[PDB]
């Protein structure tokens, strides 16, 4: 029975209120993080989103969403902010231009949540990236796009791995810096996790941000479990070519769905990584029929299981569930292989990926570092971020000033 299968027990049968309407999503889940300027509203302002939310609520939009109808609600605000940014840049107001380009990028971003599954959402992805990089270019320490040649790609794969790159000042072959490789999630891509880069730069750490297969601009085959392996071979070849980066001090940090990829590459690329971190990742039970047949109605803001199916290149959930077992790090033998240093962190009560997958990760191969966060759901925030930064600071011998670093994340 499904109600007795997983750690959270009968919690999987209780539908979350935010699935009733956008009004319930805004009031019970999204308004607070929007006000606080945190995921999924990094770089964003409540001043931009509240008026849009008011118009969506008046229209009474709800599941099942028409994603073209949904996306269009955000475009007037996104365009308004982009025009304010363009005027500021022309006047030499660098700081103001940067702010409004990034505020524009945030509005485009939410219009194509949870993943671009319509023409207007695919449009919003391209528009979001354009204004993001315009804003990124006008930062004091500019974040740049690098189109890494996908030299390890095979037939049907893209020619480049587009990544964010930030190198601290005074980094050189003579004085090389560690690199945190951030692996993004199912809905948050390189334009979202970018919020972490200035913090790392301030601690003398380079950052590269790359998307998982079937998200953002990942060139990887969606249905091929080995496609991430090729992508990381291309990305790590490129990092090793950057002599200002110490390629003996590459730390991979996977966020949410990215955690699966961070855990996987700890095995596939052991000798090229100092450590990997899975924050709210899965490994095995995340691919279960039982888990996936319940997850659409739980803590995820939209349809988690359907979004996962799309990201893995399946036309519907049933087709994904029929083949999903082949992605398991247990089933495909990954977890039996030696791994580099691994840190697993998650909330016990996660209703996006089960904590049961931390157990599977700890039940196979070499010992791994773990922190469980009791009484917290997906990502075990906020303590998870302090746990991970404390550990990375010790690993890389940084200043250990993690409060100062975390204080830079909220948008203001
Ligand atoms: O900064 C963040 C915080 C989160 O809770 C995230 C969750 C999923 C993906 C990216 C995130 C980034």
Author numbering: 1 to 412
Paper quotes:
The resulting Ser‐His‐Asp network is perfectly aligned with distances in the range of 2.5–2.8 Å between the active‐site residues.
To investigate the specificity pocket and the underlying binding modes of Wdyg1p, conjugated naphthalenes substituted with two hydroxyl‐groups and the product 1,3,6,8‐tetrahydroxynaphthalene (THN) were screened as potential ligands. The ligand is buried at the interface of the N‐ and C‐domain. Taken together, THN and 1,3‐DHN are located at the edge of Wdyg1p's specificity pocket and facilitate different in‐plane orientations. Thereby, the bottom of the specificity pocket is defined by Glu381 and Trp196, which spans 7 × 12 × 12 Å3.
